[PDB]
Assembly symmetry: D2
Homo-oligomer: 356 residues x 4
């Protein structure tokens, strides 16, 4: 008998509350793609949401979908046209890869390309598996002093990078970050690395705020039932001035309203968090003071920068990882996520290397 | 006896529905001010609103206020430190003059200075009178080939310039202007002057839309009872694509919702029109497609540019003027404004020259 | 015998002074390419330079190269993955097509991609022939009201668009354009379409300046042996102020120096013209007044915009065409170019349609 | 007899090599000015240059001039219109104060105002004295946790802030700083504070480079006799790539040429150092790769930001101070500056407090 073939065990959502570990064929990379032996994949609230609800808005899992999109791995094989990567290279994977060079890609905002492929957003399969192929231009080599888990953390970190760029965060700024979930946390980390003088973070949880303090938050405000105007007043009271930039990472209407009231005239309110289809806000208050309201849709052009910041030790994302489980314990990892305790949970897909 | 002294008949609002023509003292210019013999003043919907309701939001006329803020005149006398203007100079008056060199002024956005002086916004008296003093830095000399009425039209034109700049309007753009009132009209003129390929204008009035066509609108859409989504669809149908920039000049919630649905991903929705304190909108739809929502608060750094466009005959605002009355017929002029027919009404304050 | 096959007569430079018309195989388009039946190709000074010198700087014709890069044509056949174009479509061809999605392409500046393919820049063959294949993302459909020659003129026009964008040209600006060759001319056209109040053009030739006046130049200055400071003084004397932007389209050292002296503090000097490897300039004078010096390397993201401006009749490039010859008379067309008389010369490659 | 009056001993340059300590009248603050009891003043190479040559370019000391412009002090008396400062307030002094609200001030670039007042640039007297009056808008209150010497260091630090802003320095950048003098050093500090991943510093002095390493330089290169191309090659070798931004702080032609060869295409070369009136450089090499060449003229809008970074301990400039002398030992201090050893020398003007 011939040698045993490798496997491609994958974490798949078939529908609401129907999560399974099953084997998939091993992908064959096209001329401009690379086949990766997956190593580390972080669990994102969105992967969990598809498992629980089978959809997010109008993005419905109509056929079984492999989960996972915050990842790193090792190049196993490269397509005939690939020259910048070779077998053995450790790489961080940027999940959104444009399918066509449309005007959004040409202008530098490929994240807005309508036909973009994106790991684990139906109907595109994610990378929580053993072997996964991806466009080579979107796999970036990791320096030796950057771990696989840091490589996987580049994905959420990039949301923070894109959000801060969209907000115009820069040297000396006072920034308000609403929400201390992983997104608010990486946003806090990025704001500080960019030179923000003070970053204030809000959240409903004292525990999450305590963690925010540990990683750099200068000020924190625990939210209970105060009004948006009251929160704005308290923030200003802590800073001694209004923040030039507010990055909204909760998606809650009251928080968006608070951001409008809190932001300094001429400043910027960045909307990262996802809320309802309709929202009631004091638009006039923002517009009349030229507080711009800018949304974020994932990110673009953040991997090389994230990699440089990690390699130079300019930012430390490691404290964000609270648990790590082998791929086979994915169900337990997802139930742990649901318990709300902990922060970033890593799934280790390579049996030969379960280390960070 | 001694020669008769000059008079300073002024148009004053004492409270809701209480408008009066009354004499004021002749102002004396400080070292950095000029005394102006007022010539032409355009009537703005806001002047009319203070007359009708005695307020706009929390800006209430608590003591009698002189109306008027879109104006031009002749330098009568200059303060000791004034060197760029001399008696006899014809000037356009920029109504917002900072009282202190705060951070907003230093950063180039003096329109956002909290303590700014602004003609006819309580408690600052306007310039619908015979003689008016103003900071010399904000009185701009008019070229001989630019009329007093064009000088007065620089004020509303500047709202259009500031809005197009804030919207990023540039060469080849498809622009949607919501509203065909004077503000939407100057926005249309500026958009075309800046190189917009196509400008679509919407409005409830077929008459105002016909006027829009006469001055440059490439496409017009009369709004009746369609929904925001339907209007957005019609606009895209007419343009063959989504406009990259939408400039909202109505302040109506339905129109703002239409702007969000109509604007191309990555584009900009500029809010000029004033609506209610609270607005219900598909915020998510804009944010998730990175459609920026930017407000406008009057303008900054637009007078020299407006003067250059008028002097070079690059834009024609003359068609906007539909009526002219001497200052003494201000009541008749305001009642005419209320009738709704016509567009820009000019008040002529200098008995020695009632021409354009 | 079978039907006669089509031909692909091409204009080829073998070396200095060695220009030939010869037949080439008919290209077969890949999945993402289209085969075009060439229609109109404008002659650029660079095509002429390769013919005369066999090189430009270190770009040497080491093997026979087909000339031509300012063109339009008709889609003859499309590759299996092409969906936005179909046989029969009239298209304008953007000559620079990136070979890889490197960081320059991802950031929106694909013109700087090191491995970019560019028609008629050795070793890449141009499009002065019957049939030519090209990446489909870089062939843009022309509206029915835009001619093939206007389609070909988009290439040089795009240099002007890119130059004006890099210069920050906008509403009300006073702009100085050095040089009245086709590049200075399209730059003048673009500056005016963008809202420049006044555009001053300089050149050694009175005839070229007369043409500049015909198409929109507000002021012109004929250059003889004046010093750079003297030219700067004269320009300022004509404008009554220093121009905010200067676009250098000659490549002559004295002109670059004049641009530094002429540009308003805080303004921008754009370098389009190609000069020597080393240049002596009053760098200090520019730096100390924050006059930025920005270069241009062809263009990026200009075709859709150029097409919208032509379709809306916002710019008229037709007057730039002074002669048109069928492909077979290319030698005569190039000798005519050398005579320096005339401006844009068009070569007509489609025997079935020799019209504009 | 009456109590002794205060004195205003000042350090004055009368001509080349003619420096004197002499008494001046006590200034009287106008309505919008404050009288300051000077505390700490850093010595700048320019103050020293006026002493040695009696001029810098065409800025010549035609009448005796008080030196000094990098300073902090205590508010002694305030003008009648001053409300944000009171006697006793510790303040950092921004030396450039516009005399008129011209277009440069209105647009947010007051540093370019032609008639600006600037301490110690003839004919404007500096602040190396006991009592000095200054426009109140340009005296900024220091937080209690920020020292007088840090307040004085805000001046050179601001050159670094303005240079990094002009260079577009941001998160993850690889930056080349040419020159390890105090200007290159503050530029290094700011670059790192803004998120630069790696900053390479060059200089002729190994001692200055050792100091650079101590405060944050990731890489250093001592320059001996290599050519500009060779240095550019070494820099790229060390970084493993070309720096996106180069900040030239030497003014040397060879260094500027090296910056052009070293900077990544699409990047920026910022010119801070002052060189000769004419410079020979590979302009083409920069222009054709769209490497922008941007100059710096001191700074604008940097004091509040600098104060926020110092107050938040985001940057440490203290290591820059190597010597301190009372005002009376100014001659000794200037001779020490000329010796070349050491970096920033502080002059202490307040006999009642000689501490940092
Ligand atoms: N637009 C994008 O491209 C993009 C990419 C990533 C994530 N997101 C979204 O960003 C949001 C943040 O995600 P995450 O993973 O950090 O989520 P999360 O659920 O872990 O964190 C959200 C936090 O908001 C806090 N919160 C809720 N209401 C609040 C209020 N009124 N005031 C203050 N704090 C409040 C919660 O206690 C929680 O800690 C989500 O809505 C996510 O879907 C958007
Ligand atoms: N933010 C600022 O700095 C600033 C400065 C000037 C004016 N404004 C505001 O801009 C707005 C426009 O002012 P104006 O003088 O042109 O006003 P206007 O009343 O003359 O014109 C408004 C136009 O909107 C049209 N309209 C109303 N609802 C509509 C809808 N749902 N769909 C389409 N069209 C609709 C009306 O028929 C009318 O022609 C006002 O709210 C004004 O107060 C703001
Ligand atoms: N960087 C790029 O991407 C790019 C793209 C297109 C063209 N170019 C270059 O731009 C330049 C313009 O090309 P073109 O086709 O219009 O060239 P051209 O030769 O037709 O025109 C150049 C003009 O400059 C004039 N001139 C020469 N010296 C002058 C001086 N001292 N003062 C004033 N006028 C002077 C000439 O009389 C002539 O009319 C060329 O150097 C070309 O190679 C650069
Ligand atoms: N434009 C402005 O607004 C502004 C404001 C401040 C200072 N400056 C200028 O910036 C420059 C730096 O000033 P500073 O106080 O730090 O000066 P400095 O003299 O103390 O430092 C200059 C450094 O350059 C080094 N150097 C000289 N030639 C070199 C070369 N070829 N390669 C590498 N290193 C070289 C010297 O060894 C020295 O350490 C000066 O020219 C100063 O006048 C400009
Ligand atoms: C369902 N989506 C496709 S969406 O367009 O409503 N939008 C949901 C929120 N988004 C999220 C959430 C979590 N992680 C990411 C990217 O890692 N994006 C960004 C995408
Ligand atoms: C009451 N105002 C002070 S306000 O801040 O609600 N806002 C109202 C709308 N604004 C208007 C309306 C008409 N004309 C102008 C300026 O000419 N501004 C701009 C100002
Ligand atoms: C030889 N070249 C490759 S180059 O890099 O020296 N540079 C030369 C001048 N350039 C020109 C000249 C004419 N037409 C074009 C583009 O149509 N580019 C831009 C390109
Ligand atoms: C003589 N000057 C007025 S100048 O315009 O040649 N230029 C010289 C260099 N400059 C310097 C040098 C040192 N310190 C400063 C500002 O603190 N500016 C900036 C000013
Ligand atoms: Zn995610
Ligand atoms: Zn108004
Ligand atoms: Zn060309
Ligand atoms: Zn200095």
């Amino acid at each position: 008998a011939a040698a045993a073939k490798p496997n491609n065990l994958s974490l798949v959502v078939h529908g609401p509350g129907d999560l399974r570990l099953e084997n998939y064929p091993i992908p064959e990379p096209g001329p401009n793609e690379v086949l990766l032996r997956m190593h580390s994949v972080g669990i994102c609230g969105s992967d969990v949401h598809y498992w629980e609800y089978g959809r997010i808005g109008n993005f419905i899992v109509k056929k079984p979908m492999v989960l996972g999109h915050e990842a790193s791995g090792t190049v196993e094989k490269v397509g005939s046209s690939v020259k910048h990567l070779k077998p053995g290279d450790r790489v961080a994977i940027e999940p959104g890869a444009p399918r066509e060079n449309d005007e959004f890609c040409k202008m530098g905002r490929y994240n807005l390309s309508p036909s973009i492929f994106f790991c684990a957003t139906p109907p595109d399969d994610g990378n929580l598996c053993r072997f996964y192929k991806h466009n080579a231009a979107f796999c970036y080599k990791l320096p030796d002093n950057v771990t696989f888990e840091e490589g996987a953390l580049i994905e959420p970190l990039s949301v923070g990078i894109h959000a801060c760029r969209r907000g115009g965060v820069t040297l000396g700024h006072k920034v308000l970050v609403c929400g201390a979930g992983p997104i608010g946390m990486v946003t806090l980390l990025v704001a500080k690395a960019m030179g923000a003088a003070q970053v204030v973070v809000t959240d409903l949880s004292a525990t999450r705020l305590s963690k925010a303090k540990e990683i750099g938050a200068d000020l924190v405000l625990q939210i209970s039932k105060e009004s948006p105007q009251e929160i704005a007043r308290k923030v200003e009271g802590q800073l001694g001035c209004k923040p030039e930039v507010t990055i909204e990472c909760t998606g809650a209407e009251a928080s968006i309203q608070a951001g409008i009231y809190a932001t300094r005239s001429g400043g910027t309110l960045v909307l990262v968090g996802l809320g309802s289809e309709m929202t009631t806000v004091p638009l006039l208050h923002a517009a009349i003071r030229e507080v711009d309201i800018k949304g974020v849709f994932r990110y673009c052009n953040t991997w090389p920068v994230a990699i440089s910041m990690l390699a130079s030790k300019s930012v430390n994302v490691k404290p964000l990882v609270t648990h790590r489980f082998p791929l086979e314990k994915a169900l337990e990892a997802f139930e742990t996520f649901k318990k709300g305790l902990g922060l970033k949970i890593m799934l280790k897909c390579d049996p030969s290397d379960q280390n960070p």
